Design a protein around this ligand. Sequence first.
Ligand SMILES: [Cl-]
Lengths: 350, 355
Amino acid sequence: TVEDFKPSEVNQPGKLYPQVNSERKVRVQISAPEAKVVQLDLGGVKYDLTKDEKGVWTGESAPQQEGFHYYQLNVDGAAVPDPGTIYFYGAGRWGSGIEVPAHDADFYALKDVPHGLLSEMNYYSNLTKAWRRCFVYTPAGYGDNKDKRYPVLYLQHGSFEDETGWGRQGKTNLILDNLIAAGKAVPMLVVMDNGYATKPGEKSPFAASIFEEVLMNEVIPMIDAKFRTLSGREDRAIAGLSMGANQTMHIAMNNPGHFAYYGGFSGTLDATTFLNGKFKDAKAVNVQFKVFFLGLGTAEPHPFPGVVKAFRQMMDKQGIKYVYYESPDTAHEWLTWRRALNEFAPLLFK
Amino acid sequence: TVEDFKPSEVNQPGKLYPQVNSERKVRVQISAPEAKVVQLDLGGVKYDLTKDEKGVWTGESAPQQEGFHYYQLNVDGAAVPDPGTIYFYGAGRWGSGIEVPAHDADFYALKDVPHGLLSEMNYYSNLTKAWRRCFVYTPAGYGDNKDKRYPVLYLQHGSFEDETGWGRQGKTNLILDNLIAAGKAVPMLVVMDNGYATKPGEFAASIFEEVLMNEVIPMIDAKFRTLSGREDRAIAGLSMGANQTMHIAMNNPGHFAYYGGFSGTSNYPSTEPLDATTFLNGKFKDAKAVNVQFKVFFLGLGTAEPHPFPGVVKAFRQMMDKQGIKYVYYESPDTAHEWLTWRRALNEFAPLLFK
Ligand SMILES: [Cl-]
């Protein structure tokens, strides 16, 4: 392995490991002097670490794709976070992640530009009878012209993630900070809620979702009431990744009077029956949407490329306009969706 | 042991352990089929868990004091977070914490009241030549009242913590939400920064005072609708932060009219008598001037804090009493040098500000 390893940007303050080298290999290190086996569990592959005389374990992965990857350590059967990194919510857990620098990483860099606030908002939902929480990005100049109003993008995570995903893993505030400062995107709010919403009684993962109801009756009215927003349909966009792409498509198509932009990133056909035949009327769709956007990673596994393919095929045959973007050499992971957002946001509200 | 155990409120979604019973015992569980020894390190005590036939380890602590406690697991030598909990920054790491329900926990509860925003703010410091981050609480009515302006509390964490502490394990936004809604505290901003600040390229000397006075406060007063007079600005901290903010307050009497010291004063770690003439550059020499400077001077302490914190505060208080300098004193019953003590101190301190 090439020895130009450096601490990742995900490291806890003062922690030297994990590290990444120019081969995009990840090196982890942990002290466990009584352990029999210690492993790095990354990219669906287990790597055995090697123990030195002092009982310190060190090892490296094979080369990783650029960007962000969840991982964990295995210590004699214990699946645990790496004490070396900050933690992220995904795969149904708070756990470790590693950042492997990308060639285009500058578009989500922390730059010397005006930075918008990222705000936590707690609210009670009468529909779910539970406490909820969303995060809201306001652009840097939001506090300048106090008569000015802004459009809003509602941006949703995937399965087994939560409302913190887009803001942390997804670097949404930095992407928009940069796009806005560069004059590529209109100043906008971004609202990130939790796509899990069920009726009071139900805890089952196959229970019916009422996220559409929550977004339309509790979230959006609250945002438009509490922030200086433009609340017309041409001022409101919706998008999501994976499960969230499907959710937000459903919401957009069911509420044509309230969204004029849709973005489906790596979502998971007879236009007469599909989605209650909402794609039947090709003219109605093209009229609703100023922007209908589809995103995919070139390295995504089955079934995501197939899903997007069949969808485009239906679109093409129906004469429904859409924009399509492919993230090179990324899979069903966060860099794909960082890039999708970076390509999608500049199309909005123009 | 009373089998009263229920999932803690710090558990990750869908995780059954850790759990707490009515004895305030903490039960943890983790699967480690090949492990030889798994331990719970909590309250300064290591408890050996027991392994069952499915490779799963379970064990429980002694009764804990009420409130929030940092902890970790040990797995065959590896000091690791508990996969069962969300994580907190403290003790120099992101790691586990347990919440043992307090009898008065209602005051930091998530209640059906108007809720203010907690905002992340990133900024570059030319004094430290580094990127920094603070968190800002704005009151629930901040947006509704576009012409209204608000006073500001600057609130600092302890050693080996950071700008997220007061907001997360400190529950600052909920405490203020509740106090403000209850009409007990004036609607205010709370600004939570990182007490660590050093010169570029530098146990190094702190320049946090310079960063706070010359970069943060001007930034906040420039970006938010604040009242920016000394009588509209308060400062306070816990442990190390109590020390730092005392230094800052006494050096900058023309910018602060309120100080709060939670489990810490600047004579730390000494428990010996103070000389007002020389202590802290004689800033407490003129008792009359100090009494005029401060509308509120607040000291907090847990009744179960370890040596030397009680002795440190006692010596400071005796200095104060002798000088005839007034102060408010609050004791948190049955808590030590930990976050519930400081939650309670904020709850008592905040209602005294800007009145
Ligand atoms: Cl962080």
